[PDB]
Design an enzyme around this catalytic site. Sequence first.
Site, PDB file in Angstrom:
ATOM      1  N   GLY A  29     -22.538  11.698  17.935  1.00 38.98           N
ATOM      2  CA  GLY A  29     -22.780  13.328  18.057  1.00 38.98           C
ATOM      3  C   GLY A  29     -21.978  13.837  19.039  1.00 38.98           C
ATOM      4  O   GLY A  29     -21.109  13.159  19.594  1.00 38.98           O
ATOM      5  N   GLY A  32     -19.154  16.635  25.992  1.00 37.92           N
ATOM      6  CA  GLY A  32     -18.385  15.333  25.607  1.00 37.92           C
ATOM      7  C   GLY A  32     -19.046  14.932  23.738  1.00 37.92           C
ATOM      8  O   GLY A  32     -19.864  15.612  23.338  1.00 37.92           O
ATOM      9  N   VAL A  34     -20.370  11.393  21.661  1.00 43.18           N
ATOM     10  CA  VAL A  34     -21.199  10.271  21.997  1.00 43.18           C
ATOM     11  C   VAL A  34     -20.709   9.159  20.793  1.00 43.18           C
ATOM     12  O   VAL A  34     -20.752   9.439  19.619  1.00 43.18           O
ATOM     13  CB  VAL A  34     -22.676  10.511  21.790  1.00 43.18           C
ATOM     14  CG1 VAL A  34     -23.637   9.295  22.318  1.00 43.18           C
ATOM     15  CG2 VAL A  34     -23.256  11.780  22.634  1.00 43.18           C
ATOM     16  N   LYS A  47     -20.917   8.081  26.234  1.00 41.69           N
ATOM     17  CA  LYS A  47     -20.672   9.519  26.173  1.00 41.69           C
ATOM     18  C   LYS A  47     -19.333   9.765  26.853  1.00 41.69           C
ATOM     19  O   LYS A  47     -19.418   9.233  28.057  1.00 41.69           O
ATOM     20  CB  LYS A  47     -21.693  10.628  26.891  1.00 41.69           C
ATOM     21  CG  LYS A  47     -21.556  11.922  26.604  1.00 41.69           C
ATOM     22  CD  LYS A  47     -22.677  12.710  26.975  1.00 41.69           C
ATOM     23  CE  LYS A  47     -22.431  14.293  26.623  1.00 41.69           C
ATOM     24  NZ  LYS A  47     -23.588  14.927  27.160  1.00 41.69           N
ATOM     25  N   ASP A 134     -31.925  22.529  29.558  1.00 45.57           N
ATOM     26  CA  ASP A 134     -31.604  22.259  28.151  1.00 45.57           C
ATOM     27  C   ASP A 134     -32.722  21.550  27.220  1.00 45.57           C
ATOM     28  O   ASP A 134     -32.086  20.598  26.482  1.00 45.57           O
ATOM     29  CB  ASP A 134     -30.134  21.683  28.128  1.00 45.57           C
ATOM     30  CG  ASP A 134     -29.340  22.134  26.651  1.00 45.57           C
ATOM     31  OD1 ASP A 134     -29.796  23.185  25.925  1.00 45.57           O
ATOM     32  OD2 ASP A 134     -28.312  21.640  26.659  1.00 45.57           O
ATOM     33  N   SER A 137     -34.760  19.896  20.800  1.00 41.03           N
ATOM     34  CA  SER A 137     -35.102  18.579  19.837  1.00 41.03           C
ATOM     35  C   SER A 137     -33.615  17.675  19.690  1.00 41.03           C
ATOM     36  O   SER A 137     -33.802  16.500  19.462  1.00 41.03           O
ATOM     37  CB  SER A 137     -35.549  18.965  18.651  1.00 41.03           C
ATOM     38  OG  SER A 137     -34.445  19.520  17.653  1.00 41.03           O
ATOM     39  N   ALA A 138     -32.497  18.185  19.837  1.00 39.94           N
ATOM     40  CA  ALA A 138     -31.216  17.339  19.934  1.00 39.94           C
ATOM     41  C   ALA A 138     -31.093  16.651  21.178  1.00 39.94           C
ATOM     42  O   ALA A 138     -30.491  15.381  21.083  1.00 39.94           O
ATOM     43  CB  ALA A 138     -30.117  18.443  20.009  1.00 39.94           C
ATOM     44  N   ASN A 139     -31.833  16.890  22.458  1.00 40.86           N
ATOM     45  CA  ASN A 139     -32.042  16.244  23.470  1.00 40.86           C
ATOM     46  C   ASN A 139     -33.388  15.210  23.764  1.00 40.86           C
ATOM     47  O   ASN A 139     -33.146  14.692  24.668  1.00 40.86           O
ATOM     48  CB  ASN A 139     -31.562  17.198  24.666  1.00 40.86           C
ATOM     49  CG  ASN A 139     -30.384  17.668  24.866  1.00 40.86           C
ATOM     50  OD1 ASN A 139     -29.261  17.329  24.156  1.00 40.86           O
ATOM     51  ND2 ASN A 139     -30.244  18.990  25.670  1.00 40.86           N
TER      52      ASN A 139
HETATM   53  C1  LIG Z   1     -27.853   9.799  26.113  1.00 36.71           C
HETATM   54  C2  LIG Z   1     -27.157  10.252  24.990  1.00 36.71           C
HETATM   55  C3  LIG Z   1     -25.542  10.035  25.088  1.00 36.71           C
HETATM   56  O1  LIG Z   1     -27.524   9.278  23.861  1.00 36.71           O
HETATM   57  C4  LIG Z   1     -27.181   9.284  22.654  1.00 36.71           C
HETATM   58  C5  LIG Z   1     -27.070  10.638  22.106  1.00 36.71           C
HETATM   59  C6  LIG Z   1     -27.156  11.039  20.798  1.00 36.71           C
HETATM   60  C7  LIG Z   1     -27.102  12.275  20.108  1.00 36.71           C
HETATM   61  O2  LIG Z   1     -26.542  13.142  21.037  1.00 36.71           O
HETATM   62  C8  LIG Z   1     -26.150  14.544  20.538  1.00 36.71           C
HETATM   63  C9  LIG Z   1     -25.149  14.976  21.336  1.00 36.71           C
HETATM   64  C10 LIG Z   1     -25.455  15.193  22.825  1.00 36.71           C
HETATM   65  C11 LIG Z   1     -26.722  15.855  22.982  1.00 36.71           C
HETATM   66  N1  LIG Z   1     -27.814  15.412  22.044  1.00 36.71           N
HETATM   67  C12 LIG Z   1     -27.563  15.412  20.527  1.00 36.71           C
HETATM   68  C13 LIG Z   1     -27.251  12.304  18.802  1.00 36.71           C
HETATM   69  C14 LIG Z   1     -27.886  11.406  18.041  1.00 36.71           C
HETATM   70  N2  LIG Z   1     -28.076  10.278  18.517  1.00 36.71           N
HETATM   71  C15 LIG Z   1     -28.100   9.981  19.897  1.00 36.71           C
HETATM   72  C16 LIG Z   1     -28.286   8.768  20.392  1.00 36.71           C
HETATM   73  C17 LIG Z   1     -28.067   8.572  21.914  1.00 36.71           C
HETATM   74  C18 LIG Z   1     -28.417   7.114  22.131  1.00 36.71           C
HETATM   75  N3  LIG Z   1     -28.277   6.902  23.595  1.00 36.71           N
HETATM   76  O3  LIG Z   1     -28.575   6.226  21.314  1.00 36.71           O
END
Ligand SMILES: CC(C)Oc1cc2c(O[C@@H]3CCCNC3)ccnc2cc1C(N)=O
Length: 270
Positions: A29, A32, A34, A47, A134, A137-139
């Site tokens: 995603g 920055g 991910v 990230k 922020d 649901s995306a966070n």
């Molecule tokens: C702590 C963060 C870096 O971790 C993730 C971010 C994820 C994600 O990020 C989008 C962009 C950033 C804002 N959120 C939506 C979407 C889908 N899955 C994600 C899984 C992880 C993870 N740690 O496995």
Amino acid sequence: FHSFSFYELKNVTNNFDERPISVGGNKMGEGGVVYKGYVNNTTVAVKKLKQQFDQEIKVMAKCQHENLVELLGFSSDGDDLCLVYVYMPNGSLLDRLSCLDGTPPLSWHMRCKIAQGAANGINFLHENHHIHRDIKSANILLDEAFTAKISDFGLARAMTSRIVGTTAYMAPEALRGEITPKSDIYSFGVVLLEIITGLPAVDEHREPQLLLDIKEEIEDTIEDYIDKKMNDADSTSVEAMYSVASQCLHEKKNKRPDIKKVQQLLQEMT
Ligand SMILES: CC(C)Oc1cc2c(O[C@@H]3CCCNC3)ccnc2cc1C(N)=O
């Protein structure tokens, strides 16, 4: 926290292959970017993005809770800044609500655990004098057991000239420049509406475009809006979660309940 050299993170992410995972790349995603990485026997989230980087490390060093994502390490080899986290196999709440990539719809039972878990995460943040800024649901990330883990603390704070956040989730005073934990409450109210309805906070091809407008629409029912992709939702608990969301979405910041009351109300619901 482990300090990684940029080359290590380059190699484990297939030299930060920006193509989505479905296309054969490493991108999970963007906010920055991910990326999925494999460091030894561990699957990680990398990230790749400075003040927001230093703040993310600062918040993570102080805030360790089961309903907050865990930072494993970082990389700051000059130009490129990387943050390494524990991998969340079930991605974000946004993607699970939309059933992105054909994942099965979340049951009402699971949705209640997620809402409770997310409220516990915000409570830890507020108890520790942190405003997320922020909440969306995306966070809200989901692990292997669908445990809610709050992420993205780059804009977190311990009025402003630089207004930041996601418009569709933001409180009127936040859109005006106010920095208050009462603003996170409002945004969580929008997240609760997403949990009930399965609808995104904003949809350009929808009437109303903004999900928070359905509250005013109902105040003229919630049964018409309940996500039809569930068969275990009972009107009593759905109405009770809607009551919490309605209170969260009070346009007057001081009339909104604090996170402790939100936790208490979500506990009484199940
Ligand atoms: C702590 C963060 C870096 O971790 C993730 C971010 C994820 C994600 O990020 C989008 C962009 C950033 C804002 N959120 C939506 C979407 C889908 N899955 C994600 C899984 C992880 C993870 N740690 O496995």
